[PDB]
Design a protein around this motif. Structure first.
Motif, short mmCIF file in Angstrom:
data_model
loop_
_atom_site.label_atom_id
_atom_site.label_comp_id
_atom_site.label_asym_id
_atom_site.label_seq_id
_atom_site.Cartn_x
_atom_site.Cartn_y
_atom_site.Cartn_z
N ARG A 68 -30.97 -50.45 -26.59
CA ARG A 68 -30.91 -51.90 -26.25
C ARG A 68 -31.79 -52.62 -27.31
N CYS A 69 -31.22 -53.71 -27.78
CA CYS A 69 -31.91 -54.55 -28.78
C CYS A 69 -32.99 -55.41 -28.09
N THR A 70 -34.22 -55.28 -28.64
CA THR A 70 -35.33 -56.08 -28.07
C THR A 70 -35.27 -57.56 -28.48
N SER A 71 -34.42 -57.89 -29.43
CA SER A 71 -34.18 -59.29 -29.83
C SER A 71 -32.98 -59.89 -29.12
N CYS A 72 -31.79 -59.27 -29.24
CA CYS A 72 -30.54 -59.81 -28.73
C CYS A 72 -30.13 -59.37 -27.30
N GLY A 73 -30.72 -58.27 -26.84
CA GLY A 73 -30.41 -57.65 -25.58
C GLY A 73 -29.08 -56.84 -25.55
N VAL A 74 -28.44 -56.61 -26.66
CA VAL A 74 -27.21 -55.92 -26.57
C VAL A 74 -27.49 -54.39 -26.30
N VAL A 75 -26.58 -53.85 -25.49
CA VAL A 75 -26.64 -52.43 -25.08
C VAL A 75 -25.55 -51.73 -25.85
N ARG B 199 -32.68 -50.20 -35.85
CA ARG B 199 -32.46 -51.65 -35.83
C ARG B 199 -31.06 -52.01 -35.43
N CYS B 200 -31.00 -53.19 -34.79
CA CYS B 200 -29.78 -53.71 -34.38
C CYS B 200 -28.83 -53.95 -35.58
N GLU B 201 -27.60 -53.58 -35.42
CA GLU B 201 -26.62 -53.83 -36.55
C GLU B 201 -25.80 -55.00 -36.30
N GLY C 279 -27.00 -60.64 -38.53
CA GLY C 279 -28.11 -61.64 -38.37
C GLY C 279 -29.11 -61.37 -37.26
N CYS C 280 -29.03 -60.20 -36.59
CA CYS C 280 -30.01 -59.91 -35.57
C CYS C 280 -31.17 -59.05 -36.29
N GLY C 281 -30.86 -57.78 -36.46
CA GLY C 281 -31.79 -56.85 -36.97
C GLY C 281 -33.06 -56.60 -36.14
ZN LIG Z 1 -29.81 -57.39 -31.68
#
Ligand SMILES: [Zn+2]
Length: 269
Positions: free
Chosen positions: A132-139, A173-175, A178-180
């Protein structure tokens, strides 16, 4: 106030049960070669698993926590479901053809119930193979070995292994464009609540069940340790399958001693 060890008597309830809930913990996967939290397998380097599986740990040293999770992902790579996982899966399929429901509520993050073919699975603590992304919340599902190139050859478990000290930029890192953001394992850490939707799903299952099995779990971690007791308090038979007694044993109707890879095929036949 003390449990029965009669399989024949449990089997009489099993034959009539319409809605079985099976609660599992790490002991269900022990015969697959997956370490438990109790005992010697519950250490990584000089830490215990409950030291590392916390938001503070991650905030302080996300490289260290990722090295720990990397190691567990890699351990899992060689592991297969055992006869206890398989008996549970086959039970659900067989009973389902008769219109009878079996649901597995697992504390485990190892996905072995999935690999065995369980369909009605609630992973209450998450999965080793999701991020889970700590920036965007995507799982996202993530089974990559290694999950990022900087973790290649890292994670060794022996005490005195040097911290990899991977900068946060080089951790997973999130892929998403623009998130990362920095990823974390999509697991429930100590000190973090369960998902509300999960709590609701559990609550519905326990309230409706007419037979409960509590398999391979030490019955120390909450809220999961509350679940089988609640079913027993309603007057519903609970059968514990464990190689030992636990704090919960005496709350239940049945206690079946021994390795669950032996006892579950017999119970669920
Ligand atoms: Zn993200």
């Amino acid at each position: 106030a003390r449990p029965s060890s009669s399989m024949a008597d449990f089997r009489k309830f099993f034959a009539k049960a319409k809605h079985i809930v099976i609660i599992s913990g790490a002991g269900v996967s022990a015969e697959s070669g997956v370490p438990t939290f109790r005992g010697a397998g519950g250490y990584w380097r000089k830490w215990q698993a409950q030291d590392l599986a916390t938001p503070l740990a991650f905030a302080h040293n996300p490289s260290r926590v990722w090295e720990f999770y990397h190691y567990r992902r890699e351990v899992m790579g060689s592991k297969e479901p055992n006869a206890g996982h398989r008996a549970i899966a086959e039970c659900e399929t067989r009973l389902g053809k008769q219109g009878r429901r079996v649901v597995v509520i697992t504390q485990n993050i190892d996905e072995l119930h999935r690999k065995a073919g369980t369909k009605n699975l609630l992973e209450i603590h998450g999965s080793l193979f999701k991020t889970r992304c700590t920036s965007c919340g995507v799982v996202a599902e993530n089974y990559k070995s290694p999950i990022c190139p900087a973790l290649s050859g890292k994670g060794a478990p022996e005490p005195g292994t040097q911290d990899a000290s991977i900068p946060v930029e080089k951790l997973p890192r999130c892929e998403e464009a623009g998130c990362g953001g920095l990823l974390r394992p999509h697991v429930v850490w100590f000190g973090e609540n369960l998902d509300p939707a999960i709590l609701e799903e559990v609550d519905r299952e326990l309230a409706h069940c007419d037979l409960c099995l509590v398999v391979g779990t030490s019955s120390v971690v909450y809220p999961a340790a509350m679940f089988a007791p609640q079913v027993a308090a309603r007057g519903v038979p609970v059968a514990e399958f464990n190689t030992e007694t636990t704090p919960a044993t005496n709350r239940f109707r049945f206690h079946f001693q021994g390795p669950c890879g032996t006892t579950l095929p017999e119970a669920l036949a």
